RNA sequence: AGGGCACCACC
RNA sequence: CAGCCACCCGAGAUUGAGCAAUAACAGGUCUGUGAUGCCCUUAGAUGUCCGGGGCUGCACGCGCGCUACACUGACUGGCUCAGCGUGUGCCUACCCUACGCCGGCAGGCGCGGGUAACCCGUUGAACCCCAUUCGUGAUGGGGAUCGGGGAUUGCAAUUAUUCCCCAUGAACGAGGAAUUCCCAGUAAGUGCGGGUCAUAAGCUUGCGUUGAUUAAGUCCCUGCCCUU
């Protein structure tokens, strides 16, 4: 049980991300942008994966099931309020954006705000604080 | 009814070799208590801390730094586990190990820096500084290390009792006495 | 340098555990981790397995410190 | 391609009533519309409609000036020319579809961006 | 007869106690079953404020306080007799509330 | 019907022990004396019984009701109330000699078993976070 | 004779939770695998069967102190909320979790609504808890 | 008209809705126990009101 | 030049 | 002699505050005042109201602070203890909340109590205690910054009021010269009330809870005072 298996994977590649196999699975899939601790735990609960095993101990079928549930949360009764992209301003769809998708979403949001020349977009463009913080003394 | 610390460690067989410190290490007879937690007013008057049991003085000195201030239950648990580890490692009475560690850690000569001049050290300050050095060594060994604070305290006490140079307290005492000799 | 501990036993480390560890006077997860270059979780699990098999004896159990000893 | 807000094209947005738009809007705008627009907002909407009607074909409508920086940008306001007061001046803003749901004030900046000069005497 | 509750409230302990003692003495003289003066916990109203009218100097504070003392007396007597007993001279600063 | 009710105090914690003629029961808030938390200080509660022997308590039932203060203060209040209750019961329904000898044992071991610690929290004073500490002072 | 107050409370809670799970008539909400138990928590409970433990704890609390409602339960299960760079403060538990636990216990007929408001143990619930306490004492002895 | 505009800004809350009952100043106001007095006026009238410095 | 005092001084 | 030291008995052998002289300072406040001299302004107003903006603006320097740098810990459960005090208001709109139901949460709906030792409330506080997972890795330490969504206050929330959820995951590994506060239920840790308050604490003023190390001295430093 405590001896390392022959199929143990030191490094996994999931969604163009290097997942360390030495970490526990829940805190190992948090290496993916868009997956935090809460979302990782709920995904693994939906996937019926034992939380006590390391990332390398997972089989290929288990990894594939985890990836599928991660990329399609709504099909597995993961509630909308759990998602980091709710009611998208362009499509109105609920989803969980991950990794390059998350980066593209951030760039698109900033580009839209700058294109309409909203105040927050201008603050982002100038590189200043955008949530009303004082800038006189901090942020140097 | 014999009173044993934590219900395990007896005080009758504990011997204090150094006669200068015999009046400042309260360990047996009227000073034998079940726990190192008395909530006594030992700081009310001068020298009254000499009546405080030595295990309780160690427990008090373990409540550092700030984040651990006032957590005397935690320090009592730490001392209990450290005594258990000491007994496992040495086979001796943990009280005897603590007494020997304090005797070996107390500096006997210091320098007052009035150019520095060498002066003697009173027995009460010897005990105070021995406890301070032991706790400081344990704390610094345990910081940012997987080794627990109880294990670090046990190792520090065992090394100080043996007089080994692996002890932080022994090294500090040697440095202090060497500087005092130089300024003598 | 950073210490790289093992999350699971290899054959040599497992044999070294099962051979030498039941002979120590003081057996704690921290000392076992330091000696065998394993993580604390692996050390705790291994010591629990040894206790279940009866190779070692439990001295004290606490949420912050567990102390074992040889039989 | 074509503009969509929450997956709804502009024409459907124009067709929709306030109760239907509230479900598309974010929480702040939904609460604002639930609490209801007042006489000033209705007057501004009437002015914008009049400007749209009086605009010649294939030409932008006349600028309607207003102090209402806390006005929600409704779909019917898309295409209007609004002079939003910034405390000193009426900055001219043309309403784009992507502006739907924001405040008019967000497009009329109230301060001049800081370009720093040399520090004065003292200021160590 | 009816059960009469007299609630006395004051800022002056001495006058409050004098009034309570006089009321109980009157009730005893009229030979009435009177429950002794139940003393409610004293209320301490506090206002802590800066001493200075401006904002200058060492930040010193005034701690003003007012103490309100409350007493309860229970009687088994007719309403007319209770009113006659309460008709005695009441020291200034004592507020009396009678309930039947 | 032989009984006494004696209190013990520590800070704002107050414990009243009702000691009557009984078979040796000791309860605190209806729970066995060995079940009171925190059990790090269980010997503090057991000290009166360990010092005097179970024979002294064999003839009484003591029920302790404690309230106020904190965990440690309640522990100390309970032990003081138990000791004082036994002393009072002995001095009332037994001879003075037994009371004197048990009182001497308790006093020799620890005076706070019979005499309350009068220390109380000191009031905060303006200009500092507490009773003595002052706010940091700057000059330039 | 053994009553709840005679045994270790943590061991009693574990035994009662095991008993409830083994009986298997306790209604469990569909969202137990998704929620966290309070806004001051950072993660969902480690134990998959946290609902049975929470129900056992609630039943024990009702045994010790009857007449407690959902507000009292949320006060009981409240804890410290850390606020990033701001100081920490007390925070209450999840009202939905407390309410569902109380309703499930009522469904088991161990809990009934009190006359003066809140909930209390039925005689059947008191009997069940005392039997569990007796089992715990027997196991310890 | 001017009747509709004059004093038409809502004043149901905030500093602009409260003032010292003695001097009409709006700063340093004490509302506790319904005193509704600025701090300076309160220090002036505290002894008359019945507040004393026992301390 | 000598002598006092203070954790808003030191040790 | 005045008194000092120690000890017995004793709850206690120095509890903590408030008040506080003569004589002064061109110390602060005319932005607390229907306190006030003089000067200025007074209908295109420096009066007053209304709308909008600003007081928050950011290459930088300084001060009071909060959170941390982790294992004497973080997380997840379980268990078990306070005290001070506030609460529906002349104008005056704005109270504290039990219980039931809905919601994952912030919250919503219903229905009661309290003008209060009566109801919230036995104020089930946090730290602490008992188990769990983590394992020395800028790591499950830390939580800045930032995206999306949901509520509440309000006439109005953009320059994010506040709150909630998912996500993002910066510096920081104990801090140079220098420097602050403090000796017993004190320092420090920890939470809870009051003020401000429609919305509301990283501030302040109080409260309890856990609870020490060191000292019973000196004029060396910084000052103040006295004598010649
Ligand atoms: K450590
Ligand atoms: K003035
Ligand atoms: K003037
Ligand atoms: K003036
Ligand atoms: K001002
Ligand atoms: K004022
Ligand atoms: Mg991630
Ligand atoms: Mg404090
Ligand atoms: Mg809690
Ligand atoms: Mg200084
Ligand atoms: Mg110094
Ligand atoms: Mg001047
Ligand atoms: Mg300002
Ligand atoms: Mg964290
Ligand atoms: Mg990290
Ligand atoms: Mg302020
Ligand atoms: Zn005034």
CSV table of C-alpha atoms in Angstrom, one decimal, chain D residues 2-124:
chain,number,residue,atom,x,y,z
D,2,UNK,CA,-23.3,40.8,-34.6
D,3,UNK,CA,-23.6,42.3,-31.2
D,4,UNK,CA,-25.1,40.2,-28.4
D,5,UNK,CA,-25.8,41.0,-24.7
D,6,UNK,CA,-26.1,37.8,-22.7
D,7,UNK,CA,-26.6,36.1,-26.0
D,8,UNK,CA,-29.4,38.4,-27.1
D,9,UNK,CA,-29.1,40.5,-30.2
D,10,UNK,CA,-29.8,44.3,-30.1
D,11,UNK,CA,-33.2,44.0,-31.8
D,12,UNK,CA,-34.5,41.5,-29.3
D,13,UNK,CA,-33.2,43.8,-26.6
D,14,UNK,CA,-35.2,46.7,-28.0
D,15,UNK,CA,-38.3,44.4,-28.2
D,16,UNK,CA,-37.9,43.3,-24.5
D,17,UNK,CA,-39.6,45.2,-21.7
D,18,UNK,CA,-38.0,46.3,-18.4
D,19,UNK,CA,-39.0,43.1,-16.6
D,20,UNK,CA,-37.3,41.1,-19.3
D,21,UNK,CA,-34.2,43.3,-19.4
D,22,UNK,CA,-33.9,43.0,-15.6
D,23,UNK,CA,-33.1,39.3,-15.9
D,24,UNK,CA,-30.3,40.0,-18.5
D,25,UNK,CA,-28.8,42.9,-16.5
D,26,UNK,CA,-26.3,42.4,-13.6
D,27,UNK,CA,-27.5,42.6,-10.0
D,28,UNK,CA,-26.9,46.3,-9.6
D,29,UNK,CA,-28.8,47.3,-12.7
D,30,UNK,CA,-31.6,44.8,-11.9
D,31,UNK,CA,-32.0,46.3,-8.5
D,32,UNK,CA,-32.0,49.8,-10.0
D,33,UNK,CA,-34.7,49.0,-12.5
D,34,UNK,CA,-36.7,47.2,-9.8
D,35,UNK,CA,-36.6,50.2,-7.6
D,36,UNK,CA,-37.7,52.2,-10.7
D,37,UNK,CA,-36.6,55.1,-12.8
D,38,UNK,CA,-37.8,58.6,-11.8
D,39,UNK,CA,-39.0,61.7,-13.6
D,40,UNK,CA,-35.5,62.9,-14.5
D,41,UNK,CA,-34.6,59.6,-16.1
D,42,UNK,CA,-37.9,59.5,-18.0
D,43,UNK,CA,-37.4,63.1,-19.2
D,44,UNK,CA,-33.9,62.2,-20.4
D,45,UNK,CA,-35.4,59.2,-22.3
D,46,UNK,CA,-38.0,61.4,-23.9
D,47,UNK,CA,-35.4,63.8,-25.0
D,48,UNK,CA,-33.3,61.0,-26.5
D,49,UNK,CA,-36.3,59.7,-28.4
D,50,UNK,CA,-37.2,63.1,-29.7
D,51,UNK,CA,-33.6,63.6,-30.9
D,52,UNK,CA,-33.7,60.2,-32.6
D,53,UNK,CA,-37.0,61.0,-34.3
D,54,UNK,CA,-35.8,64.4,-35.4
D,55,UNK,CA,-32.4,63.1,-36.7
D,56,UNK,CA,-32.2,63.3,-40.5
D,57,UNK,CA,-31.7,59.9,-42.2
D,58,UNK,CA,-28.2,58.5,-42.1
D,59,UNK,CA,-27.1,61.2,-39.7
D,60,UNK,CA,-26.3,61.2,-36.0
D,61,UNK,CA,-28.9,62.8,-33.7
D,62,UNK,CA,-28.4,66.1,-31.9
D,63,UNK,CA,-26.5,66.0,-28.6
D,64,UNK,CA,-28.7,65.9,-25.6
D,65,UNK,CA,-27.0,67.3,-22.5
D,66,UNK,CA,-27.5,65.9,-19.0
D,67,UNK,CA,-26.2,65.9,-15.5
D,68,UNK,CA,-27.5,62.3,-15.0
D,69,UNK,CA,-24.2,60.4,-14.5
D,70,UNK,CA,-26.1,57.6,-12.6
D,71,UNK,CA,-28.3,56.8,-15.6
D,72,UNK,CA,-28.4,53.2,-16.7
D,73,UNK,CA,-27.6,52.7,-20.4
D,74,UNK,CA,-30.7,51.1,-21.7
D,75,UNK,CA,-30.8,49.4,-25.2
D,76,UNK,CA,-33.1,52.1,-26.5
D,77,UNK,CA,-30.4,54.6,-25.7
D,78,UNK,CA,-28.0,52.9,-28.1
D,79,UNK,CA,-27.0,55.3,-30.9
D,80,UNK,CA,-27.8,58.5,-29.0
D,81,UNK,CA,-25.4,61.4,-28.5
D,82,UNK,CA,-25.3,62.4,-24.8
D,83,UNK,CA,-23.4,65.3,-23.3
D,84,UNK,CA,-22.6,63.9,-19.8
D,85,UNK,CA,-21.6,66.5,-17.3
D,86,UNK,CA,-18.4,65.8,-15.5
D,87,UNK,CA,-18.7,68.6,-12.9
D,88,UNK,CA,-17.3,71.2,-15.3
D,89,UNK,CA,-18.0,70.2,-18.9
D,90,UNK,CA,-20.5,68.2,-20.9
D,91,UNK,CA,-18.3,65.5,-22.5
D,92,UNK,CA,-19.8,64.1,-25.7
D,93,UNK,CA,-20.5,60.4,-25.7
D,94,UNK,CA,-22.0,58.2,-28.4
D,95,UNK,CA,-23.8,55.2,-26.9
D,96,UNK,CA,-22.4,51.9,-28.3
D,97,UNK,CA,-24.2,48.6,-27.8
D,98,UNK,CA,-21.3,47.3,-25.7
D,99,UNK,CA,-22.1,50.2,-23.3
D,100,UNK,CA,-25.4,48.6,-22.4
D,101,UNK,CA,-25.7,48.2,-18.6
D,102,UNK,CA,-23.1,50.7,-17.6
D,103,UNK,CA,-23.5,54.2,-16.1
D,104,UNK,CA,-23.2,57.3,-18.3
D,105,UNK,CA,-20.8,58.7,-15.7
D,106,UNK,CA,-18.4,55.9,-16.5
D,107,UNK,CA,-17.7,57.5,-19.9
D,108,UNK,CA,-17.2,61.1,-18.6
D,109,UNK,CA,-14.1,61.3,-16.5
D,110,UNK,CA,-14.2,63.8,-13.6
D,111,UNK,CA,-10.5,64.3,-13.2
D,112,UNK,CA,-7.4,65.0,-15.3
D,113,UNK,CA,-4.9,62.1,-15.4
D,114,UNK,CA,-1.9,62.9,-13.3
D,115,UNK,CA,1.4,63.8,-15.1
D,116,UNK,CA,3.9,64.4,-12.3
D,117,UNK,CA,6.3,67.3,-12.1
D,118,UNK,CA,9.5,67.7,-10.2
D,119,UNK,CA,9.0,67.4,-6.4
D,120,UNK,CA,8.9,70.7,-4.5
D,121,UNK,CA,11.0,72.1,-1.7
D,122,UNK,CA,11.3,69.6,1.0
D,123,UNK,CA,9.3,66.5,0.3
D,124,UNK,CA,12.4,64.5,1.4
